[PDB]
Design an enzyme around this catalytic site. Structure first.
Site: not given
Ligand SMILES: NC(=O)c1ccc[n+]([C@@H]2O[C@H](COP(=O)([O-])OP(=O)(O)OC[C@H]3O[C@@H](n4cnc5c(N)ncnc54)[C@H](O)[C@@H]3O)[C@@H](O)[C@H]2O)c1
Ligand SMILES: NC(=O)c1ccc[n+]([C@@H]2O[C@H](COP(=O)([O-])OP(=O)(O)OC[C@H]3O[C@@H](n4cnc5c(N)ncnc54)[C@H](O)[C@@H]3O)[C@@H](O)[C@H]2O)c1
Lengths: 536, 536
Positions: A293, A280, A327
């Site tokens: 991240e 786009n 994470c």
């Protein structure tokens, strides 16, 4: 105002222990009961109006006790997403026009509200919805979030005083403008601090934002919105839209005013957004800034000089804190044979006794996996481990989704030095092949976020720091490679990533500005001819 | 070495005037003759070996006297590009292993060689090949390049001391690593300083590089390589490949080790590279970092309180210095009627007398356009202006490519407030519609790189700085908006761009690093149980 003001100096917020007899433990019990007993509608917050939308109703439940509802949200429709984008654009002019110190005071106030009267409320919403022990909730939803706010105010104020040199006869200044258009923040389940930071960091710098939190974190997301409102965040500056994000992205990624995306989550989702923006690209007024991240899995190498008790503890915490869902968690450990002889049976015995259960019992070490999809992925992994010749299940591997999404801490022994959960793979290597193991790690280093070496021997430590310099983005010596604290362990990212600008330093905040230079010349030339042109 | 060393403190290099009687003028005449009389082969420099390749021979000529050859290069073939990529990868380990101060000393030495014994040589190669007057060459090829080197050494050294907080019982440090893989620098015709900076900035931070300079700048590019070699740049750290770049990009963009592209040039070329990288994204070991800047055209608004002599001079310099070919030149001026009454005839008279010719005659103000394609684009523009009802040619519009690519300074009067060259469009607006003109500018602000307001009235100046805050990336008060000096006017970029990290600040150098955090814990936990878990 005629002043050059300074912000309060940040320090890291102290972590409460919630030990028996402590007053914060009493307060936490009260909030745990209050939220678990009074489930609520979890609405969109658009332009300051809290409202349920017309999409599908989705229940948010306790993962460790999944029949127990905490609230119900509505899946954002295209109309809800369009209202959020318009509210963000309608709030922009009054928010960007506020002086920096008035914008900063909202987040400093939010920080002190979270440190004090909202502390256990937000810690409890995170424990309940995300299945975090009180410790895991305290370091994340309370301390990390507080430090993001206090530190980003200090980092922003440091950015604004970075100014150029003025030559004779001129004055040069730099103005750090906000972006044009709105920022879209998309936030993951696993940290209430990341979820609060992604939308608020660009807002501090004068932007406005639509925020799509993860469904399973939405109780704490909504309580975070209330807190920000209590701190004085003006309506429309951040707009919370709930659900799976698909209709939100349909609207936001098609809007020409998209200025940026602040994302944390899986590489698969980030790649889909990056592709979509690229496809786009021709319709946007500004080149959208994609910032954030993605995850990874961490490794630990213990040299023959490793302290066995430190190593045992780092492995248990690193792999099994928050059921492996940070994470980055320790997934792979490479341990010298002589050290395995000293701590290997103790690691398996402590892993077998580790208590995972409902985290309103504060004696539990941890809770359940976040949702049924996570549980399925963990069962598939354990069954793959049981069927693979290269791996033995040494301890654990049991699972049961009847009460909550429970998977036991599992230790796999892998004979070959070649998704989030409480699984740890250990490869035991002969002591004298330490350097060769380092090579193996470096060669397998694609999704390497963090690495640790456990070794009292300084030569071994330096060998690891050097040989694995490019094999991981954050490196730890004699500790678990989990648990980064704002201000203390910034940066890194997986090998090959371009994530220097992720949360935790001033470089993230600069992504949400567009600096212009302003030069005033006091006595500019009044003849265009240059000295070289003279005759001669 | 046991030391925490400091680099020399940078200051901007003084600009020599080359006035008659000055010694630098004599030295410049000697170098102009030497290069114009002895045309040379302009080879690739790969792995330290200077060699012509097997591609097409292309002559580099004096644009102001295009029958006069300065040298001949070969269009890089796929084989030449592949050799450059391999040389860059073969040099990486010894270059990244040099301590920062040894890498910095190459560029500080290169700076002092350019300030002293190579000064007129490099200024003359730029005058000759790029058709720059001595002044234009001195501020670019000499002063700007020297300042990039001295300042980037100081900015790099400032980056390396940005370090984190250490809590009790730990030591946290940050290591700014170079990238993995090679950087591809692609550089434009118009600045010998940009052309030298793009490849050397990532090299300073421990990377290696393939550099593809613009054909018409290649005499100065090659002399720049020789200079760097003279400063001690080790072979293969930067590899110069000549020609139109098409076979180089075929090789470089297909190689999995591509770590980044440092580009300055047109948006069309940058978009082609960005698309190509995106299409190939799945083959790279690292996410390639695309960094640089594209052009734009600048505007000047003179309020009724503008000093007419300052405005006249800013317009002549801004539009006609270096024949309009500076990354941004003044193309559009909006002048209050009362000020036009005072300076309008003088501007047209001075523009009509401005001397463009061979720039070895130091009395000329400037030279020719860079090449036949530029000349064609300028003729098409002037003929479009003559045929358009909204525009009148007030002075100039003549052109002749018989000796050199010459186009006269041209001033167009435009009745409607709605490619590089010496063309200036002036719209004269009634004094009382200053604020309305500011609105018009803001609404037309897509390719707005720089803007200037000329006004002694402080209210008018502040009105411009505010109303046009988002309409341009760099803003100037009472001067021409051209001529940014390293350290003094960083940043900006066209509206909507993401170019905070372009050359001129430490943020560019950080793009060529991947920072890791290293945490050492001195006395880590030896029991995994947390305080909250106690009974109670
Ligand atoms: O598991 P995790 O939470 O660590 O990582 P994940 O990448 O699965 O999700 C992180 C966040 O992205 C959201 N998301 C996923 N696809 C999306 C899309 N197409 N549009 C908008 N939002 C989307 C998730 O709902 C969550 O808020
Ligand atoms: O005119 P200007 O010099 O200001 O701008 P420009 O964008 O035309 O060129 C800037 C530089 O890019 C080079 N270039 C153009 N297309 C290329 C490609 N496809 N691959 C590699 N290099 C390419 C040019 O030769 C020059 O070195």
């Amino acid at each position: 105002m005629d002043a050059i003001t300074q912000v309060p100096v940040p320090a890291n917020e102290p972590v409460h222990d919630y030990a028996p007899k402590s007053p914060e433990r009493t307060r936490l019990r009260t909030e745990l009961a209050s939220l678990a007993d009074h489930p609520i509608d979890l609405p969109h917050v658009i332009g300051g109006r809290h409202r349920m939308g017309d999409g599908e109703r989705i229940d948010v439940v306790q993962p460790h006790r999944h029949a127990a509802r905490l609230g119900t949200l509505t899946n954002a429709t295209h109309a809800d997403a369009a209202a959020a984008v318009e509210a963000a654009m309608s709030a922009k002019s009054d928010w960007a026009a506020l002086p920096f110190d008035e914008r900063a005071a909202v987040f400093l106030r939010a920080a002190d509200l979270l440190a004090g009267p909202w502390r256990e409320k937000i810690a409890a919403a995170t424990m309940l919805g995300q299945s975090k022990s009180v410790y895991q909730a305290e370091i994340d939803a309370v301390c990390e979030l507080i430090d993001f706010w206090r530190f980003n105010v200090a980092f922003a104020r440091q950015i604004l005083e970075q100014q150029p040199i003025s030559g004779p006869g001129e004055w040069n200044r730099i103005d750090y403008r906000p972006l044009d258009g709105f920022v879209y923040a998309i936030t993951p389940f696993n940290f209430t601090s990341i979820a609060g930071n992604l939308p608020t960091a660009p807002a501090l710098m004068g932007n406005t934002v639509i925020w799509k939190p993860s469904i399973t974190q939405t109780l704490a997301a909504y309580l975070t919105m209330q807190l920000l409102e209590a701190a004085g965040l003006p309506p429309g500056v951040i707009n919370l839209v709930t659900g799976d994000g698909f209709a939100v992205s349909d609207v936001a990624l098609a809007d020409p005013r998209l200025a940026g995306i602040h994302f944390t989550g899986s590489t698969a989702t980030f790649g889909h957004l990056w592709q979509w923006v690229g496809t786009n690209i021709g319709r946007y007024h500004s080149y959208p800034r994609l910032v954030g991240e993605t995850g990874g899995k961490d490794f630990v190498v213990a040299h023959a000089s490793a302290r066995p008790d430190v190593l045992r503890t780092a492995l248990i915490r690193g792999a099994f804190d928050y059921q492996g869902q940070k994470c980055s968690a320790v997934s792979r450990a490479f341990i010298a044979h002589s050290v395995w002889q000293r701590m290997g049976d103790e690691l398996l015995a402590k892993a077998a006794e580790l208590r995972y259960g409902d985290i309103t019992d504060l004696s539990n070490y941890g809770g359940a996996l976040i949702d049924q999809r996570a549980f399925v992925k963990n069962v598939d992994a354990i069954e793959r481990a049981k069927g693979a010749a290269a791996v033995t299940v040494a301890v654990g591997g049991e699972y049961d989704d009847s009460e909550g999404y429970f998977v036991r801490p599992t230790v796999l022994l892998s004979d070959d030095p070649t998704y989030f959960g409480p699984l740890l793979s250990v490869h035991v290597y002969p002591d004298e092949r330490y350097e060769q193991i380092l090579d193996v790690i470096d060669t397998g280093s694609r999704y390497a976020l963090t690495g640790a070496v456990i070794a009292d021997d300084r030569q071994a430590v330096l060998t690891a720091l050097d040989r694995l310099r490019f094999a991981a983005g954050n490196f730890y010596v004699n500790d678990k490679p989990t648990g980064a604290v704002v201000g203390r362990q910034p940066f890194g990212g997986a090998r090959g990533s371009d994530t220097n600008d992720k949360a935790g330093s001033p470089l993230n905040l600069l992504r949400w500005t567009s600096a212009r230079s302003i030069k005033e010349t006091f006595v500019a030339a009044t003849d265009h001819i240059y000295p070289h042109m003279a005759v001669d």
